[PDB]
Amino acid sequence: ILSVLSSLALVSGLMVVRAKNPVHSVLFFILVFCDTSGLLLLLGLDFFAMIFLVVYIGAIAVLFLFVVMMFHIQSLRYTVYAGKVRSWTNLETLGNLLYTYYFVWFLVPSLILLVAMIGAIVLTMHRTTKVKRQDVFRRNAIDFRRTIM
């Protein structure tokens, strides 16, 4: 029966866009991701289920939870026994491609993660380091020192 239980994801997605209390919004966000990972499990894409878990409800909705807590808003099959003699786990059959054949679409997300690092640095350093912690800065010769107030 768990097949049609994507209705849970469906209603939780309707919650996040029709909720004024942000805690409920982020909770049903996490719920949408959990049910989407359930779906991606039912399809057998095991790697993508765990990646949804990790890089969504252990990083991204962690971010969103932070933004809520602080900064409150207010029969007939014919199985072909060939190609089953060596079953390729999903990670192996993503790595056979992403790093050798389509590797530039993998070095470009490298640049996108680097731009995300540079961006989170230049944006949210918040004048807390050399961006402004260099010094207040002062020059004596130009300074009036009581000659001009």
């Binding site: 878990l53 939870l65 807590m69 786990t89």
Partner: protein
């Protein structure tokens, strides 16, 4: 089902680990630990429990029961469900996932939720910022554990934990990658809090650092969780690096070679190492600690993925 046969013995394991820690860390300090309650303090865990259970609440407060009365349940359920994929002997894993390792990584990424939620429901600014600091620590030594597992994964073929412990028949990954075991242990020390790395767990700041409504069940469940997370993260330093259930393979006449007994011996070694290293070393202050997970165990983990990938690519050892 047979999930009872992996949760009940683990509950007993955690209850007796509180005693094993007190007793070992006491023996270190030239003093017998809990020693009057049971024959050798063996009943002391049951005494701690049966005491915490019989302690009247400070305030009933059963109204707020969906917010933080299921958050310790969540933390503990995660610490216990990461035990499915952990194999104790050949064909003794409860569920051999062909992506087992990544599933452990995801379970940690959800333990982050456990901590953050159980700290936010405590309406104490100091305790909530403490829980957030603890979550940021647990998640900053998770990129280092991630890369350490990428090393032990490069050595192995697949993420299947039964394969990672089957890929060590020739030699445990503790012998060639010993520097990595030291980094996984010093990270598992820091991923969990129980470590030289526990300023959020500085004796006082811990109790006032997880929740406001204790009722005893919350106190026990957090400690039962920390001690299961510890048995787990010590049952990983023994699958990956030490031979999960493999002997030294000398094939003795005196030793009939049981598997789960070897896994038990090794996880006992790593639990004893958790205790010993809690006794003998000062705390890291969480300001040198976060500057050790980024500036020390991430560069030394990245180097290791490039070293164990290089040295295995040049000579076709993969």
């Amino acid at each position: 089902a047979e999930i009872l046969g992996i949760i009940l013995p683990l509950l007993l394991g955690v209850a007796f680990l509180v005693l094993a820690e007190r007793k070992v860390m006491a023996f270190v300090q030239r003093r017998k630990g809990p020693d009057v309650v049971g024959s050798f303090g063996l009943l002391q865990p049951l005494a701690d429990g049966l005491k915490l259970i019989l302690k009247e609440p400070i305030s009933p407060s059963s109204a707020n029961f969906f917010l933080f009365r299921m958050a310790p349940v969540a933390t503990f359920m995660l610490s216990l469900v990461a035990w499915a994929v952990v194999p104790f002997d050949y064909g003794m894993v409860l569920s051999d996932l062909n992506i087992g390792l990544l599933y452990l990584f995801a379970i940690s990424s959800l333990g982050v939720y456990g901590i953050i939620i159980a700290g936010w429901s405590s309406n104490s600014k100091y305790a909530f910022l403490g829980a957030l600091r603890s979550a940021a620590q647990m998640v900053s030594y998770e990129v280092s554990i991630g890369l350490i597992l990428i090393t032990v994964l490069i050595c192995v073929g697949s993420c299947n934990l039964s394969e990672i412990v089957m890929a060590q028949k020739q030699i445990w990954f503790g012998i060639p990658l010993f520097p990595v075991l030291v980094m996984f242990f010093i990270s598992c020390l820091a991923e969990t809090n129980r470590a030289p790395f526990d300023l959020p767990e500085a004796e006082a700041e811990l109790v006032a650092g997880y929740n406001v409504e204790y009722s005893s069940m919350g106190f026990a469940l957090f400690f039962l969780g920390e001690y299961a997370n510890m048995i787990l993260m010590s049952g990983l330093c023994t699958l990956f690096f030490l031979g999960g259930w493999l002997p030294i393979l000398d094939l003795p006449i005196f030793k009939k070679i049981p598997g789960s007994i070897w896994f038990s011996i090794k996880v006992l070694f790593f639990l004893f190492l958790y205790i010993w290293v809690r006794a003998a070393f000062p705390r890291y202050r969480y300001d040198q600690l976060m500057g050790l997970g980024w500036k020390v165990f991430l560069p030394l983990s990245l180097a290791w993925v490039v070293s164990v990938s290089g040295l295995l690519v040049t000579f076709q050892w993969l």
